[PDB]
Structures are given as C-alpha cells and as structure tokens.
Design a protein around this ligand. Structure first.
Ligand SMILES: *[C@@H]1O[C@@H](CO)[C@@H](O)[C@@H](O)[C@@H]1NC(C)=O
Ligand SMILES: *[C@@H]1O[C@@H](CO)[C@@H](O)[C@@H](O)[C@@H]1NC(C)=O
Ligand SMILES: *[C@@H]1O[C@@H](CO)[C@@H](O)[C@@H](O)[C@@H]1NC(C)=O
Ligand SMILES: *[C@H]1O[C@@H](CO)[C@@H](O)[C@@H](O)[C@@H]1NC(C)=O
Ligand SMILES: *[C@H]1O[C@@H](CO)[C@@H](O)[C@@H](O)[C@@H]1NC(C)=O
Ligand SMILES: [Ca+2]
Ligand SMILES: [Ca+2]
Ligand SMILES: [Ca+2]
Ligand SMILES: [Ca+2]
Ligand SMILES: [Ca+2]
Ligand SMILES: [Ca+2]
Ligand SMILES: [Ca+2]
Ligand SMILES: [Ca+2]
Ligand SMILES: [Ca+2]
Ligand SMILES: [Ca+2]
Lengths: 204, 204, 204, 204, 204
C-alpha cells in the first residue's frame, strides 16, 4: 500500500517501544520462503532483524544477529547459524531461504552464499503471523526486549513463498528483486509504532 | 571577514588557552542545520571538534570525538554516537546534519554516511551562541578543559541552516561546497585567542 | 551410477549418524593415489573430510582438519600435517596425493602446493575400504564421533590410483579434472545414510 | 668535501662509540630550517636520527624516534611529536622543518605530511653546533648512550636554512632535492669515528 | 656432478638423522662469499637453513632462522640478525653475503634487501668445512639437534666466493643465477643421509 522504493525505516534509538508491524494476508502455512532485505547498524550486541510469531508460538520464523559475522534463522524455535567475513560497521544485504522438504536454510550475504544448514525438515511455518521490525517478539505481537532491539536502518525488504535460485538472489542484491508475493517493499502495508522515521536510502 | 580558502587553523599544542571564536549573527533558533569541516589530528584521547553553547545551556550543539572511529553529536545536552571504520592517524572530512522535525542526525565521514540516529525531535537549537574551535566550552564562551582540547588542524568549515542532501555533502567533501549561510570558510568572521596559527592546507 | 556434476552433498547438522558411503569397484591395495574435492564449512572445531578404514584397521587413509589453516593426512595410522594461509570461513579446493615409494604426501589448497611431508614409505594402503564422508570412522564403516562430524558441503570429489602432476591438479581445481578411476563425481556409487541432502553447487 | 651520491653510512652494530660528525660552518643562529634524509633500521627501541648540540645546550636540535610510528623534534630542549602509519621494518624518507616566527614544525614521512605541531615560537636555534649521526649527544660532541644509538643505514641527507614548501619536500623524497646550504649529501664534510662503513644505497 | 635444476631436496619429517652433506673443493679460507637458496617450511620453531662447521669450530658459517621474520648469520660463532616482513607459511628466496674487509653482512629476502649488519671485520672463514642441510651441526659433521632440524624443501642453492651486487642477487631470485664457484645447484656434489627425497620444485 506504500511504495518505499529508495527509502528506509530508521530506528533511531534503543528502546522497547519503537517498531514497525508488517501486514500480510498469509492464511496458509508456509512450506517454502525467501526473505531479502538491507540493513545498516552499528550495534555490537545481539539484535533481531525480522521477527515472525504466531498465536501461541514464539520464534516461529526469526532472523537474528547474535554478533558480528554470525547470522541465525529460527524455524519453530529451532535454529541454525552460519558465519561470514564482514566489515564492521557496514551496510549489508541479507537473503535467507528455507525449504520444508529438505529443511535446508540458505543465507546469502552481499550476494555471497554462506554454508547451507538444515532444520525442521517436514515442518510447516504457521500462518496468521505478526511480523515485526525493530523489536524481537516474545508474544503474539509484543513482549519486546530492549536488549534485542534493532537500532539503525532497514530497507529493500521482500519476501517470496518460494526458494529463490542464486541468480534471483543476485538480482535482489543488485536492487532489482523479482516480483515478491508475501512482502513487497514497493507495495508495503505497515504500521509505525513509537519512534520510527522514514528517510531516503543514502548508503546504497 | 576573511577568505580562508586553502588555509587551516593550526592548534599546535595542548592547552586550556588556545582557541578560535567563530562569529555569526544568529538571532533565530535553529530548526535544521548542516555542519561540514576537515580535520587532521593525531590525538587518541577524546576531544571537541565544534563547540556551540548559549546562555545557560551547555553542549547546545557539540560535535565531539570520543575515541577513534566514534563521532558524537550533542543537541541541547542530549547525545547520539555513530561508528565508522577509519585509519589512524588520518585526515578526515566530516559533515553532520540534524533536523528538528524528525530528530534525525546524519554523520558523513569522508563522503560515506554513518548510521542515522535520532534525538531532540521537536527541539529548537537556541540562538545567540558562542562558537569555539580548539576547546570545549562548559560556560557561555569559556570554562575550557585541557583534556578536551583539539590539537591539530581544521579547515574548510561551513555551516548551513538546512539539511544537505547527499549530492551537496559530496560537493563539500570534494572541495566545491554550496554557499553556506551560518558559517562560511570563504567569508569567516573569527577571533584567534592564544596560540593558533593560520597555515596553508597541505594534506588534502 | 550417478552423475553429480554441478551438485554437492550437504551435511546440514552435526550428528553421530549422518554420512555418505562411497563405493569403489577398484579393489586393490594402494601404492599411489590422489584425492581431490571441494568443501565449504564454517566449523572451527576439528572434523574429518574423508575417512577410509579397512577391516580391523582404523585411519587407514584419512584426511582430517584439526583446526583452521592445518590439513592432516593419515596413512596406516601415521600422520603428517601441513599449514596454509586461508580465510575463514571460505570454500576450499583440496587435493592430496601420496606415493609409497618415497612416502611423500602433497597437499594442494586452491591450486597452491603446501610443504611436502613424508610418511609410511614402502607401505601399501589396504584394499576393501569403507569410505565415508560426513563422519570419522573408528570401526569398519562405523563408530562415529559427533565431535568429528563434518557439517557443510562437499562436491567435485575424484580419486585416482596415481600421483597427479601439478598440471592435472590445476585442471581439477579449475573444474576440468582428468577422469578418475577410484572415485569419480560424474559416475559415483554412493549411499546416503541419515540427513544428507543433494543440492546444486552455488559457491563455485 | 665528499660526494656521497648513491651511498649510505652503515652503522652495523650497537655501540656507544660508533658515530659520524657532520661539519658545517654555521655561525648564524637559525630562525628557519629544513632537514631531509633517508633511513633504514630494524631497531624497535628508541633512537636518535640527527643530534645537534651547542656549548652548554643539550637537544638544541634533535630528531628522535621514540618508537614505531612516532617522530619527535626537539628545539632548545622543548619537544613535539607526531604520529604516522608505517610498516616495520621499512626504509623511510623523513623531512622536518621548523619556523621560528610561528613555532610550527612540519614532519613529512615518505612525502606525506604529519599533523603540524608548534614549539619555541620566536626562538633562534644556537649556532656553532656539533652534529652527530649514529649517537645521541648529551654533551657538546659526546656523552653518548648506546640505548639511543642508531643501528642501520642513513643516506641522502640535506639541511637548508629555510622552510621548504611541499613541492621541494616531494622533490627530495623522489630523489631530486634542491641543493642545500647547511648540509648537502653531494658535498658532505664528515668524520667517521669507530665502526661506520660507507656502502652503496641498495634499498631506495 | 648432478644438475638439480627444477628439483628440491625434501626433508619430509622432523628427525636427528635426515641430512644432506654438500661437497665443495675449498681449501682456502673465505674472505668474501654470497649464499643464495630457496626454502619452503611450515615450521614455527627455530631451525638451521645452512650449517658450515670446521674442525674444532662450531657455527663457523651458519644461516639460522630463530622465528618468523628474523634471519641470522653466524660467522666464526659471532652472530647478526636482521628482520623482515614476511607471510607464514610461504616459500622464500634467501641470499646472504659477507665481506671480511668491512664485516658487512647483507641479507636479501625475496629480492628485498634487509638492513645491513656487521661482524668479524678482518676475519677469515676457516676452510675444510663440513656443510650440512637439514640439521644444525654442533660438531665437525654431527651432533645434530632434532629441535633445530629443517623440515620442508630446499632448492636452487648457490654459493660464490665473492659479494654479489644487487643485479646478480635479483637474477638468482628470478631464476637465472650466475654460475657459482663454491656450490652450484646445477653441478652439485652431495650425499643424502637418512630420509631425504629429491622431487620436482612445484612451488616456484
Ligand atoms: C515448496 O517446495 C517445492 C519443492 O522444491 C515444492 O515442493 C513446492 O510445492 C513446495 N511447496 C509449495 C509451492 O507450496
Ligand atoms: C526545517 O526542516 C524542513 C523540513 O524538511 C522544513 O520544515 C524547514 O522549514 C525547516 N525549517 C526551516 C526554518 O527551514
Ligand atoms: C606408483 O608410482 C608410479 C610412478 O611414481 C609408479 O612407480 C608406480 O608403479 C607406482 N606404483 C604402482 C602403479 O603400483
Ligand atoms: C623564515 O621562514 C620563512 C617562511 O617560509 C619566512 O617566514 C622567513 O621570513 C623566515 N624568516 C627568515 C629569516 O628567512
Ligand atoms: C674480497 O676479499 C678479497 C679476496 O677475494 C678481495 O677480492 C676483496 O677485494 C674482496 N672484495 C672486497 C671489496 O673486499
Ligand atoms: Ca522471541
Ligand atoms: Ca525476546
Ligand atoms: Ca560542555
Ligand atoms: Ca567540558
Ligand atoms: Ca578413526
Ligand atoms: Ca574417531
Ligand atoms: Ca641529549
Ligand atoms: Ca642522551
Ligand atoms: Ca652449532
Ligand atoms: Ca645445535
């Protein structure tokens, strides 16, 4: 509903209040997905990048940054973590995909593939989520934790109900994502809560 | 007023005495500003780069270097800090802007944007400042602190009453800044106190 | 058998179970061999890359990574280790050859030769192995150890009953290996046990 | 008196005895000077590069290296130090100038300007010096200290009674120095004492 | 008597037994020499590269590597050491010359000159040596020490009875050495003892 092309959400301070709710009419459990976005933060502590909870289910789909050079994906509370060489601080483009049939999770950082890991083969990610940027949920939509808050900037966020092949991940990294059907930065339905400011993306 | 094109102020030693007063007929409170300048220092300790105090108000607008790789902006005593990868020692070009309506502070270091932070949304920076280079003020024009003194060289200082877009920041970095209406290096009204020497800029 | 051109085995989690059995029909003791393969793992702990045991004989031919930058070859329980400068994590191409007549072991890492070492001169590597990827054997086909399990991806595996000269090693590294007579990725007889997934090779 | 083009003094060992006296008919106190030379040493401890003392005055003009990356100039016992990024060990080209009227000292290391510092504004460096390479003087011509001795090679030394502008500094660095009126490598009047060997310059 | 062009000695293991004796027609004491060779080792501990002892005289001419980045030359039991920036592990080309008349020792590492040092000015290196690769002699031909043994590969060894100019050093480094009258890799008289294997040089 809003085209955020060329813009970012700025989470300008540490808080337990500041967040964006992302709204998607996701009625069917997810068997496959890819999520891509850009982020720029100079936090050294742990923080959540993308928090997806469902009723009665915490950490149903969570992209979490434990520390520099380490990215984690949670699926139904279980997690995998893969490492990468990265500068700090530095803008980053992140893609992560997961496929129920194999359980394989693929992280791509700045268009470079990390080591594949695997979890929750056969599982379906539950539907009707609450999806939050800026805070890590411990409840269905809430129970945030200041020490897990994201401070910095996020943009170019897209989510597909399939596993993107390498050349489509590269297209997203280059700023030309293929059509996305779960979340789309160019037609995004969202709710700002607390202190979140929309600004031009100046670091790509 | 003096055209300091191609020249720098040299603060050649640590002291509590040496400083430059910058004079501007600033009568109305500031809602928006951008400040750019070049500096070269081999201090490892903390130091003030640009100190702006008003009657009864400390750190009304302060650009302060905590340590290598970390830049702070104070607005009305409140502070934000953002990090960057930089060599040490090394000449640097710094721009910082702040916008009351959003509270957003943007640092640019050698033409590269740091992570945005936010403070004092809705605040107006007071007018009738005393503006000092070389020392950090704790009073209106004084109460300096040797351990916060700037030792080294500063040049190409410009201050605008608006937030510069990236193209204008890069122009400043490259040595062709837009005309500036609060402070302008090519028409600077200043007072040297103590040991400050004007020399050609040899390090750009 | 199976042509795995353009594919890898993914060992997506640490376990004492997940492995691939590799079957060679060439049944003879080995006086000379070369083994080449690609691997991508972000483990920092020790792990087995290629485990070849015979009846009643542990570590008959073993390629083992004790830590970053250090590759070990075991021949008949004796071991040599050579060091290399490598980024971590990073995909790697590994070739190792051994020649009974001299005892010389040559490791090549990304087409660069490591320092030669020597062991078991005059020895013959025993015939009729169980050859395992993903786990380190302590028995004939079993007695695995989760703390030595391989997590990550292996592809482009070839094994010859001769010592390859540098030009052939470079050919393998570049993706044009000479056909191999003990094990060949383009005609591989394998058995997956437990959680191992075949995926496209996306990192080379 | 001697043309040392393409040659260095080699101080091949640590001692309290080995040195070179440089003779100049300098009768007028110095208001301005520049000194350039090349050096190559693998000492990590402190050492004197150029020691100029006058009767009753220690450290009248001294260029001293306290540790890697730090160069000091003394004028009349007072000192300033500036820092630089440098590899170790590595050959270096050093220029330093000082100007009484401003007190400004400029170090240039491999043609790169260090941060300016200032000392002894208004002072005149005393004439009738004893000038020593290889040792640091604490008396007029003597009282050396082996813990301050220079072990290594020095060449292409020039001293002018003016402050060289950047173009002339770069010319010296690139091997086209302006002829010099206090000390000049093409016509150097020197006395070797102890173990000092003249050899071709093979490193720069 | 053997042309070892394109080949190396491989010392494939740590031992107190494995060594090569080099045989030269040298009855006259040495006043000048240059020694060049190429080596590739991943030892971190100290080791001997070239050990030349005479009757009743230990360390008469010894090239020894105490630790990464540091090369030592002994002449008649006296030693000098010079430092260099180098990668580890990495193939290296080493030349060292010594001149009795000046005492000057020149090390060149990968065609780069180290800081000159000086020792034993006026001394004559004794004749009738036993020359050993692979072990450090403490007696005339023996008393080896496993903790000083060279493990790895040595090739392209030449020794001249003169001090080579830089152009000739660079020629050796580049693979076109001048003919050498004390030891010549292309016409070498040697004795292998213990486990030493001749292999092609694959790392140049
Ligand atoms: C998702 O995964 C693929 C297999 O790669 C298909 O099995 C697909 O049907 C899966 N599920 C869907 C589209 O819902
Ligand atoms: C400053 O900020 C902008 C908003 O982009 C404007 O609101 C501008 O009017 C503001 N204030 C002034 C005095 O120019
Ligand atoms: C192995 O090594 C080759 C060449 O080095 C031959 O010597 C070969 O006979 C060796 N042994 C074999 C093939 O059994
Ligand atoms: C010396 O230094 C120069 C600056 O380059 C001038 O200031 C000059 O007047 C100074 N004084 C003398 C004696 O030459
Ligand atoms: C070295 O020593 C003797 C014997 O070779 C002379 O030849 C001498 O000239 C040599 N070289 C020099 C410069 O001393
Ligand atoms: Ca949670
Ligand atoms: Ca939480
Ligand atoms: Ca203050
Ligand atoms: Ca203060
Ligand atoms: Ca085993
Ligand atoms: Ca085991
Ligand atoms: Ca002194
Ligand atoms: Ca002294
Ligand atoms: Ca010895
Ligand atoms: Ca010994």
């Amino acid at each position: 509903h809003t085209d955020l092309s060329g813009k970012v959400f700025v989470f300008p301070r540490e808080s337990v209040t500041d967040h964006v709710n992302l709204i998607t009419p996701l009625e069917k459990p997810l068997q496959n997905f890819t999520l891509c976005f850009r982020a720029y933060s100079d936090l050294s502590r742990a923080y959540s990048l993308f928090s997806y909870n469902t009723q009665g289910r915490d950490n149903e789909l969570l992209v979490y940054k434990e520390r520099v050079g380490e990215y984690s994906l949670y699926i139904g509370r279980h997690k995998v973590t893969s490492k990468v060489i990265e500068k700090f601080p530095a803008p980053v483009h992140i893609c992560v995909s997961w496929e129920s049939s194999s359980g394989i999770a693929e992280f791509w950082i700045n268009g470079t593939p990390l080591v594949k890991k695997g979890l929750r083969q056969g599982y379906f990610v539950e539907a009707q989520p609450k999806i939050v940027l800026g805070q890590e949920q411990d409840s269905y939509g809430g129970k945030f934790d200041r020490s897990q808050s994201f401070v910095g900037e996020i943009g170019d966020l897209y989510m597909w109900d399939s596993v993107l092949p390498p050349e489509n991940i590269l297209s997203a990294y280059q700023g030309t994502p293929l059509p996305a059907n779960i979340l789309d930065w160019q037609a995004l339905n969202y709710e700002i809560r607390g202190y979140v400011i929309i600004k031009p993306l100046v670091w790509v």
